[PDB]
Amino acid sequence: NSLEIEELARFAVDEHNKKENALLEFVRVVKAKEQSWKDDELFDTMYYLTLEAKDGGKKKLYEAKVWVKASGIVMYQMNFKELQEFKPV
Amino acid sequence: NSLEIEELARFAVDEHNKKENALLEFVRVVKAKEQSWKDDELFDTMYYLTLEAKDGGKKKLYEAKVWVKASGIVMYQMNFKELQEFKPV
Amino acid sequence: MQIFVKTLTGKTITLEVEPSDTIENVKAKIQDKEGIPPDQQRLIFAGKQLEDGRTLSDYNIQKESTLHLVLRL
Amino acid sequence: MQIFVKTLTGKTITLEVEPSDTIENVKAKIQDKEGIPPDQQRLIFAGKQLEDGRTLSDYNIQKESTLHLVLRLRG
């Protein structure tokens, strides 16, 4: 289950084609944004993708949101702590 | 290697003492701010902590910034993908 | 019903359960096969960490489902 | 030098190395003791993933340092 931006965009197209019985053709990834959230001992990531696809042989632009649950997991033994700032208030 | 806010504040105080040859005495943690992000195949978390310590036997409030590297790790077999939104533009 | 539990080193253990079974009971079965105490056990399904109170059926776990096991050291 | 490699199952491996050694060389040592191919090996020190080309002294890895090992599985 890869996390590369192009694979995520293709997942979006394949999932969209299946849900709405359409047949768009993936062309390119234009831009991507990622925001992450920590839930308990797991990590979640949201991907915001701008992509190129062909609807009727006509190239169009689409925006997709992909939610990845357990994109990461907490392992306490490997974490490394570093102090950046220490000041009185 | 705990990620509990109280343990993190003690780390900040203990590290500050070693770094600046001082000896502040940890009392308690008041509040914390946390945000996480994915770096390569790892996750990092940044902590902003407000705590109480004793300087001369007098309690004071301090603000600390702690950077935890590899607070999480990417494991591909466990991630779960879901498409949330697909729209033209 | 039979379900699969997979370790981070890729080893797979087979379990016998029923949908009514709780997560605490599944951890107990894992403890008997692998000698790991349930308190030190972490179970992941569908991108979520399973809670002790709920049952297998609550998470919509079915035959030939695969769960992921993580240890607390 | 003697360093420690720890698996996610809590197993600890003892190794013999010295600072001139590369990460690729450490992975080779791990394979000889534990039969795991280097491509499937991920090594963690000080919260970062170690690159094969560099040496232990580059990462300031020292006597009794502990490395963390994570496996890459196709499954």
Side-chain angles (χ1 to χ4, degrees), chain A residues 1-18 20-53 55-58 60-89, chain B residues 1-22 24-39 41-57 59 61-89, chain C residues 1-10 12-23 25-38 40-72, chain D residues 1-62 64-72 74-75:
Chain A
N1 313 296
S2 180
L3 288 181
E4 29 193 307
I5 299 296
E6 174 182 355
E7 203 65 22
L8 288 162
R10 280 185 148 103
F11 164 81
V13 175
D14 296 348
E15 210 70 8
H16 172 84
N17 283 347
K18 154 181 176 196
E20 293 308 336
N21 294 318
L23 285 72
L24 284 59
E25 270 181 9
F26 177 80
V27 180
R28 221 198 333 152
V29 187
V30 182
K31 275 146 41 220
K33 188 183 332 167
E34 72 170 50
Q35 192 185 189
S36 293
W37 175 264
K38 182 170 156 170
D39 178 18
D40 224 313
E41 287 167 346
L42 294 173
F43 287 93
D44 291 352
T45 307
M46 181 73 76
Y47 287 102
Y48 315 83
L49 311 162
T50 299
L51 61 87
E52 207 156 48
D55 189 359
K58 208 201 192 100
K60 312 188 151 178
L61 271 191
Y62 302 84
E63 280 176 61
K65 280 162 83 172
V66 178
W67 181 235
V68 185
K69 291 267 297 166
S71 62
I73 181 163
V74 172
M75 304 283 117
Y76 300 98
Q77 64 266 40
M78 51 183 59
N79 64 42
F80 184 73
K81 293 185 275 280
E82 200 173 308
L83 175 74
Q84 308 275 104
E85 267 186 314
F86 196 93
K87 63 184 175 74
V89 301
Chain B
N1 284 281
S2 179
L3 287 181
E4 277 284 324
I5 61 178
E6 172 181 355
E7 286 299 311
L8 287 162
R10 284 184 152 104
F11 162 80
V13 174
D14 297 349
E15 207 70 7
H16 173 258
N17 284 348
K18 285 165 190 192
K19 216 143 172 178
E20 295 208 353
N21 298 288
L24 286 61
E25 185 174 71
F26 177 80
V27 180
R28 77 184 179 103
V29 190
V30 182
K31 54 179 171 185
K33 282 184 191 333
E34 158 196 17
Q35 305 294 154
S36 293
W37 69 95
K38 180 173 155 282
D39 183 8
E41 308 190 64
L42 294 172
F43 282 83
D44 291 353
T45 306
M46 183 72 73
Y47 287 99
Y48 201 74
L49 310 110
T50 300
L51 60 88
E52 274 181 336
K54 286 179 193 173
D55 189 359
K59 286 179 182 161
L61 268 189
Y62 302 89
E63 274 174 25
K65 204 186 183 192
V66 177
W67 182 15
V68 184
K69 290 184 252 193
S71 63
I73 178 163
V74 173
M75 307 285 312
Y76 300 99
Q77 64 266 41
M78 282 169 208
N79 65 41
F80 184 72
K81 294 183 211 307
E82 257 172 5
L83 174 74
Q84 308 275 276
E85 191 184 56
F86 199 96
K87 63 184 175 184
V89 280
Chain C
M1 58 182 318
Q2 201 175 253
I3 66 179
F4 302 144
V5 178
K6 195 179 185 167
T7 300
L8 290 181
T9 69
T12 303
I13 84 175
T14 305
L15 281 181
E16 250 290 319
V17 297
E18 298 162 358
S20 66
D21 287 322
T22 60
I23 301 305
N25 276 356
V26 179
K27 275 166 187 187
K29 304 196 170 51
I30 294 173
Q31 167 183 47
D32 290 345
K33 287 186 160 273
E34 286 284 4
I36 303 149
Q40 302 177 25
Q41 281 184 55
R42 278 168 80 190
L43 289 180
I44 316 289
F45 182 72
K48 302 178 185 66
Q49 192 168 303
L50 312 171
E51 290 186 325
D52 291 8
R54 305 210 198 137
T55 64
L56 282 189
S57 57
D58 294 339
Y59 288 107
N60 191 39
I61 291 154
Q62 288 171 32
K63 275 199 71 69
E64 296 174 3
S65 279
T66 171
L67 284 60
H68 293 95
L69 170 71
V70 176
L71 290 187
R72 275 175 185 134
Chain D
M1 300 203 301
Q2 133 179 300
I3 65 180
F4 302 98
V5 176
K6 194 209 326 207
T7 80
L8 291 181
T9 70
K11 189 191 188 318
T12 303
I13 302 160
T14 310
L15 249 53
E16 273 294 321
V17 300
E18 235 142 56
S20 169
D21 288 322
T22 61
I23 299 305
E24 187 63 14
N25 277 356
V26 179
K27 275 165 187 187
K29 306 248 202 302
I30 294 173
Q31 168 182 6
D32 290 346
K33 286 189 70 168
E34 286 284 326
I36 303 149
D39 57 318
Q40 302 177 2
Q41 282 184 55
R42 279 204 271 163
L43 289 179
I44 317 288
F45 184 71
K48 296 286 179 257
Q49 267 203 221
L50 311 171
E51 289 184 353
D52 291 8
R54 313 208 195 309
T55 65
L56 279 67
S57 57
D58 295 339
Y59 289 108
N60 191 39
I61 291 154
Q62 288 170 30
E64 283 205 7
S65 279
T66 310
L67 287 202
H68 294 282
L69 171 71
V70 176
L71 290 186
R72 296 184 179 277
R74 193 178 171 88

